Design goal:
Blueprint (H helix, E strand, L loop, with lengths): L23 H7 L3
């Protein structure tokens, strides 16, 4: 519901629900290691 991204090319939404917890959302940091 919180779609306020219009200043770049966002791959996918980290979360679009009240009770969600995807993996890719954390993978963003996994790239660091």
């Amino acid at each position: 519901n919180v779609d306020v991204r219009y200043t770049y090319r966002p791959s996918v939404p980290a979360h679009r629900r009240v009770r969600e917890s995807p993996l890719s959302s954390d993978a963003i940091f996994k790239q660091s290691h």
